[PDB]
Amino acid sequence: YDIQAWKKQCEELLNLIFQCEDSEPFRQPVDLLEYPDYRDIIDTPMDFATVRETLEAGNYESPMELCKDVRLIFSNSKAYTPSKRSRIYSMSLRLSAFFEEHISSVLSDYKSALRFHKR
């Protein structure tokens, strides 16, 4: 019932995500010189370095907030892709599956710990 445990669990999951080749297009903000129309489609850019920095700055209060930003990385890729067969979009789907598989216990344990705190 450790209410703080999610933070290190999220740091470790972000480390695994950075080791993965599929995260390379998402490690830093999308390069606007490479994709000049990006901000015409995407209102809120997000990337894994921004997530890691927000976490390290102590600017996430819960793993739900981190999970919303990570999910925004994937929804931005789905919105920007010209095709469901695109290389970078296909990488985002594999990364999303891996993230969701691993974040589920982090969220469950955190929510359980908060319920125990108010039992």
Ligand SMILES: Brc1ccnc2ncccc12
């Ligand atoms: Br990194 C990563 C991303 C996507 N799928 C993965 N599957 C297994 C292990 C690491 C993975």
Ligand SMILES: Brc1ccnc2ncccc12
């Ligand atoms: Br092309 C493409 C497809 C999907 N997501 C993308 N995100 C960033 C840069 C290029 C992308």
